[PDB]
Amino acid sequence: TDRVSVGNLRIARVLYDFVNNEALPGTDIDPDSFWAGVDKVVADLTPQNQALLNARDELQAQIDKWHRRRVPIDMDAYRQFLTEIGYLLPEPDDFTITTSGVDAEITTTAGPQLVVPVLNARFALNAANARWGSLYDALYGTDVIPETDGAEKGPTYNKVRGDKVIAYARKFLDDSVPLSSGSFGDATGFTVQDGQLVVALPDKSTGLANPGQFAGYTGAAESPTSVLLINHGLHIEILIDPESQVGTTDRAGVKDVILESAITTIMDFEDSVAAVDAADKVLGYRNWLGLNKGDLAAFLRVLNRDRNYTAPGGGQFTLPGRSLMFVRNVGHLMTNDAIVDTDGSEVFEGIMDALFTGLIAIHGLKASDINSRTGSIYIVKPKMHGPAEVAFTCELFSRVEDVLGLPQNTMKIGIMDEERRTTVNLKACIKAAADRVVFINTGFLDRTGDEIHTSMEAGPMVRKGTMKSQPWILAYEDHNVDAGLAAGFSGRAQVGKGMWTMTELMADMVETKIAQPRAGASTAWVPSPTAATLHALHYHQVDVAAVQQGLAGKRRATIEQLLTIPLAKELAWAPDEIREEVDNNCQSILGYVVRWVDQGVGASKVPDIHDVALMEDRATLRISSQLLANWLRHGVITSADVRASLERMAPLVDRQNAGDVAYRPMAPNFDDSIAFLAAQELILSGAQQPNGYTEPILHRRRREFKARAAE
């Protein structure tokens, strides 16, 4: 691996050539001033970054020893212990965030937020274009409309099914933009007359119960090619084309209901991608640059232009055609050898992402074929532990801004609430970023990993399925909204909640995920453009602004309930229960790692023991592996149990990769597979991974595979 010398740094060539030739051109930043800033910032801030990591390590070891002693569970001493060692810190005086220059998609619009692996250009394209989405297509192609008799998806179009689809959308129209009398089911056509939309019923004509909800149209107003509506800030478009295949059989000629869906999208460098050397990081960076320049393209799929409409009065306007883009950097933990120093030390990957994803984002503020119409750069910062780690991110962005020539506080931060030391100090974390913070979000799967590892010593934890209802997570989700609303997040920043992982269960999603807007959350996470279109339905039924107003001032979680450790009860499980939980964890562990290590895929649909398809990434692996590591620390299972289960499920994994050519199997030669040995190591060494993180082992084993594939 050939490097380029810049001060104390030895930048890998592929990254040096990439920043120079692709990312710096067009930003009026001088390559020598850039790299000099990289060198200076890295030398300046690498100390404190490593101090913070040792603090984690040190705090975790006192808690470790504290549990080991202890013979009960007195919560007042635990409280007093964590406060004394500086885990639990004072709550600052109330305040209100000052974050200026933020986009309407973030301060004001409530609606779905999509997260996508930035290293998959085809997915990253679809996510950017997921601002608008076909409701017919999402209802038809998923199980929202059951596949009962007559209505099952065929190879051709099912009209029984298609009619149910139409009926479903008509009830949504009724439940969202109601008529003065009558139903959209009984409509026969639409007109705008005197700046007012008029729906033709069979016997009469009616207009909107709230004509305000009429937003515009396209085509000649006498028979518009489409009618644009709004509700709760989110846009509905009825497409009217009577000679389209679906439109011919429709009573008002309707061709589709288009829903404003993915309002924002997070392009992800962290848990949903595998990127272990400068080659990998450049693939992601280059995709990130193509999104920001407007020219990322796969074929030939390209990014969509804005959308022109006609106002009800008669003028013209236009609407954002793409999803407003965050980028999720990696956090404070890992280093990458894309850059090493003279001693050969690897450079902190978090710092590298702030420089490089920041630099690249300048294109997003510029006329090439535009992202933040108000001037801001949106960085999701994951896996932070406490307020001092928030301030360090602040300082890092400050130093990257002036190396980049950007006014201060240009790089805004979306705060992940996914580490226990952040949870129990959330308000101080928000205060630490008061003039940058652009959202908070409950990363509940990472938060469950940290929950398990922090109390790894206290005793055996409840099964994975039981965590969803444990007291600590119920108080964690409420405590997050309270601190958000108390810091003035309404009309200023997003209050966001977590990922729906059951990519095939859209019936359950449409039925369940409504609890998040009902919870006061102005955004929540979806795994596909289709799930975004469906999740948008929830924001039309729930008035999130109204919900937030009714939560103002409420304090709904005690510090004592946040610290309620999900321990299991004496003799709480039977042999087949334990056997099932083990098998299930090993299968989710194995089926994710094998594609991580063997192919560099950081997010994969992996069916669990019940054959429920779950989109996995590092956080759910953080949970499966730390749970098994905890049952091992306390005797629930043995190392032969784990070895057995691993060899039990592994051939089933190899089989499931029946869909996927050029793939290496794990079974029978378990000790000859780097993926199997990594799966094993994540479990058997899980207790000793800092805060239960999976990157160290995953990264080291992925490079191992790459190096063995060099021969």
Ligand SMILES: Cc1cccc(Br)c1C(=O)C[C@H](O)C(=O)O
């Ligand atoms: C856990 C997960 C599954 C599928 C896609 C994504 Br995206 C994620 C997250 O990384 C979410 C998150 O950061 C968390 O900690 O739950």
Ligand SMILES: [Mg+2]
């Ligand atoms: Mg996470």
